């Protein structure tokens with residue numbers, strides 16, 4: 001019943017000893033691509049979401065039994081290629097000579113000292129990040145390195161890149177490792193299931209997992225969310241933020257409607273079903289609607305809560321898989337070689353699981369739980385005094401910002417790559433806590449101890465020489481130029 005290409009993929013994955021849960025999931029995605037539909041989510045197929053509960057209005061806290069059954073997992077499998085990064089993004093220095101991983105470890109240390117003595121912590125790594133992460137922890141956090149292989153690390157899968165023309169697995173003799181890729185952070189569910197770790201966690205009495213992006217250092221356990229899921233009997237919960245103009249990269253919440261006749265005497269009830277639309281899933285034609293922050297104002301933080309026994313149950317009863325919608329990425333087998341074979345890379349997003357559970361929901365959270373670093377512009381804000389370190393080692397906005405992050409717009413021609421960004425701040429990172437918006441155009445270099453207030457634009461029209469701001473300069477609601 002399977003196509004010759006699909007069977008070629010099975011053989012390649014079996015010969016490579018890929019676990020069967022990954023194979024089953026990949027082949028189901030391969031079939032669907034071979035048929036035709038590419039899981040595009042057009043505008044006519046969805047509606048905006050209107051009403052959601054808000055974390056800031058909740059007050060009930062869960063008891064310590066619920067809290068002790070919660071696992072924390074941080075995603076760490078991607079690379080920061082967009083920022084000119086060839087390793088795990090979590091090894092970037094973010095503040096005071098400390099990296100994302102430093103603060104992650106310190107947060108876990110704090111929760112074990114003051115809240116949950118035996119907190120279970122996991123990191124999802126990939127083939128591209130595991131070595132660096134392990135070497136980093138051995139030298140700085142021995143207590144994590146001691147149990148890294150056995151308890152902390154969740155290794156995600158590698159799946160074959162498939163040729164566009166035939167859908168067979170690609171061949172790249174120069175470097176066969178480039179014939180494989182991690183299939184997105186949606187792979188967390190397949191990796192947990194296929195490795196037996198999901199079953200193991202449920203056996204050990206864990207009932208909730210809190211997952212968040214490795215680059216988001218504002219995400220920690222909140223006992224008001226756990227009480228909410230207990231009271232409302234929620235099995236999957238997505239934290240969303242009110243969307244700003246700085247939220248370009250990820251995905252937004254949306255809804256559909258399904259009519260259920262619902263037994264006899266009682267009438268049919270309209271039912272809302274929630275879904276996630278990633279940028280990669282929107283047709284380029286309808287991209288004007290995807291970026292409309294008024295129509296779709298709820299932005300996925302990727303702070304996710306999952307009821308582990310339910311996850312395990314629906315995966316078992318669905319062929320040992322979670323059938324998430326696939327994202328068909330288009331690339332060359334070697335990215336640095338635009339002449340190499342053209343391929344599709346099948347991926348999924350873990351937020352898409354909001355559509356897999358009958359009792360799924362979303363909650364609006366404040367910006368204090370969402371400090372993403374997708375660009376060097378984000379890294380500039382994070383490194384500045386606009387962000388502070390809490391007692392439990394989170395990075396949150398300084399109270400003076402009032403939950404509005406400073407809007408940082410840096411010239412992509414000069415500051416998209418890390419090396420260009422390090423030039424911009426060679427002599428010091430300006431004060432931004434009082435700055436509503438800063439725009440940098442052309443080649444610029446901040447001075448030592450600058451202070452930006454209000455709406456600042458630094459502009460250099462020639463871009464041969466760097467406009468170097470004088471040390472101590474203080475700019476208030478103005479454009480600065482040569």
Ligand SMILES: O=c1ccn([C@@H]2O[C@H](COP(=O)(O)OP(=O)(O)O[C@H]3O[C@H](CO)[C@@H](O)[C@H](O)[C@H]3O)[C@@H](O)[C@H]2O)c(=O)[nH]1
Nearest residue numbers: 075076077078182184185213214250251300301302349372
């Ligand atoms: O195969 C992969 C790919 C990514 N990651 C990790 O997943 C996290 C998120 O990846 P990133 O590429 O930084 O984000 P996006 O997938 O573009 O967007 C995610 O995060 C956004 C919020 O920042 C949400 O809006 C999107 O819905 C959600 O999919 C990072 O820690 C990555 O390292 C993995 O572990 N494995």
